[PDB]
Symmetry: D2
């Protein structure tokens, strides 16, 4: 089973955790986009009812609108029952790196308050340790970008300002900030790294999502499997 | 000779308009990037003095810093003597389309106040009529994006929301807004279309730059050529 | 009737224009707050149903959420049926000055698309000519504030950067911009000035709302009056 | 002496720490405003030279410009030699609460990197413990405001969204965010609390400034007093 098939199978499995009268955090990225589309189809056909989505990005929000899924802001709802999203890396303890799509801040805001956080990934996302393949995206107040790079470099991270393709200059997040991608060698304690990185003045949020994922749905090459803690 | 060579020769010619003690609007994009490097080099050699650049984007700002050119934002200076910038299209009346790099708002803010606005282009940017080759970028308040696209259908604009590559979702400008690229089949009155677009609630700025460029320096396969009003 | 009762009676009259299944633009400020509250109670009692509000500010959004009115951004809906909002000045031709609350951009975005735009004011808001009592608020990209104040002096506007009370420095709008309050002696041609101001690079919106209001409901000392064009 | 006199003498004492060729972080608020003024005057008299200021807010930047002090952004300089700023509270261990002026994020960004951080206050600012007289300002991503207030209850904090006076709705910071002012009973472990608050998803920065101030200059009714770590 190729990559797109792996993503699709994970998205389909996620639907099994969604019920009528739920407020659902809507993730960002290609794997979760399949889930949003399928959810929209179920709602249109009447197979599920009374669903509201709380989008983690404009991407998720616009896609939900296109698919006629009711949308609400976090401060509009009383609670997020289930949040569904993807990940760039998932380590064996179900700690994640997220942020390749630049939406890590709203993602954490919404997923932190979720009853159940369900992560959708294809096989390639499973790593032996965080930063085996991907850098940690860090959202930063623009004025602080150079100072933060310097400081991370001392910490032995290879850190670079993320640059635009469909704009000149740096990538701007939905919040108007810059993103530094910091490749650390290997993160042995994700939670404490997550906490202490946020203490750096100018750091808005970082891409380590430790001790938050409840269920990881993995589209493996030979089918769907789940990891839980 | 080739594209980058054409860009460089236009950038070198632009130095002819720069004198000691000037405040210079620093444009965005690759053609002007050559000008900024050449300017920084002339400053380092002492061939020019007391120059201050007013960057039209983070890209321009960072580049000027790298080349040790003093900079200031518009509200720090009392005049912009000369502004130098590129363009996506240049018609025979010196009307331009700008905004492919998504920095059109700050570009127009600075260039509008310039004593002389000098445009740098290679041969490919010249068109017989605006929109012969490129769409008009329009920066908009995010929630107005869908209505604006629909409203532009009266001009048969094939308007689309610009999507990110190094972020998921829409491109976000330095000002936190979306960009719609409107592919008009033609614009027979650029000045009044520029006004029309600016009268639409939700539009921050649009990429039609009519009645503003003073000189266009063109790098051609046979050397430098100019256009003037 | 005292002033508060004048506001409330205008709000009560606006409700008569609201029907089931409508999408309603929700204005900003104290007069419209009465309308939002009254609408919420009608919805709560089931006297009206299936309403969606599109807020013109965080103030309106949070108030609507507090009163359990479903909320959506402009790009979430297919149309605005009716928009209700206040005004700082209303001239004999029903042209307005708005923006004292600093939400003029989203207000115009939503109200421009309304099937019917209803304005709510108490007696005090009626004037013989725009700028008889209040300045025109102008929302600007921060960097352009100084140049714009200088440029407005040409028209003999006394223009000042609006300053914060509960923050140091300038007032920041919901869109991250500054507000210049420009006091013209008088505005004999609101629509033309409105357009002229929006064509200045750096101006993203201005408080002249000309040729947009459909109905102005005035709360007076004795009762309610409806003004139409 | 009254408060304005206390502020002025603290400011005058600060000047003594400034040397030629320094890069100085320019604080926000009335006390530091005196310093900036004096610095500008000294520079004009030729009593000091080659000074560059890095402003912590638009207020500080605009004041520096008015006093002809050259300025630069943090990403333009290689170091901050001295940072001068005010405070809302100073405890006996020289931990501070800052942010009444809403500029706490840029303040901490610049002051965190300063060779020496000098705090200027009048008598009223000294406290027995943090939160004796003032709340802790917390800058937050707008959508997270309600969730964060609710979560702050575990600290028995009285937390409120800061509201605008010269705008309707919430105060917006220079970064486009909201401010929650949280009144804790008292803070016994300022650094620990400073860290904890920044771990909350949606919190950009908080007003506790622990283990950062080097010198606190206090204007009192009996003259200047200099506290040091
Ligand atoms: Cl992402
Ligand atoms: Cl840029
Ligand atoms: Cl551009
Ligand atoms: Cl991009
Ligand atoms: Cl997005
Ligand atoms: Cl307003
Ligand atoms: Cl205020
Ligand atoms: Cl400020
Ligand atoms: Cl402050
Ligand atoms: Cl608001
Ligand atoms: Na903005
Ligand atoms: Na922001």
């Amino acid at each position: 089973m190729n990559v797109e098939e792996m993503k699709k199978i994970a998205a389909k499995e996620a639907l099994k955790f969604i019920e009528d009268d739920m407020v659902i955090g809507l993730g960002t990225g290609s794997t979760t986009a399949y889930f949003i589309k399928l959810l929209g189809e179920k709602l249109k056909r009447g197979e599920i009812s009374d669903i509201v989505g709380v989008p983690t990005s404009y991407q998720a929000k616009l896609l939900a609108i296109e698919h006629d899924i009711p949308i609400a802001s976090l401060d509009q709802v009383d609670a997020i029952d289930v949040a569904v999203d993807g990940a760039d890396e998932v380590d064996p303890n179900l700690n994640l790196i997220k942020g390749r799509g630049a939406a890590l801040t709203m993602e954490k805001i919404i997923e932190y308050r979720a009853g159940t956080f369900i992560v959708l990934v294809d096989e390639r996302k499973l790593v032996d340790y965080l930063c085996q393949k991907m850098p940690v995206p860090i959202e930063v107040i623009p004025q602080a970008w150079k100072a933060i790079i310097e400081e991370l470099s001392i910490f032995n991270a290879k850190a670079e300002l993320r640059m635009g393709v469909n704009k000149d200059g740096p990538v701007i997040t939905d919040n108007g900030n810059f993103i530094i991608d910091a490749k650390f060698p290997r993160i042995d304690d994700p939670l404490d790294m997550e906490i202490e990185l946020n203490t750096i003045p100018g750091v808005i949020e970082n891409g380590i999502f430790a001790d938050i994922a409840d269920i990881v749905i993995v589209g493996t090459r030979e089918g769907v499997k789940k990891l839980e803690r």
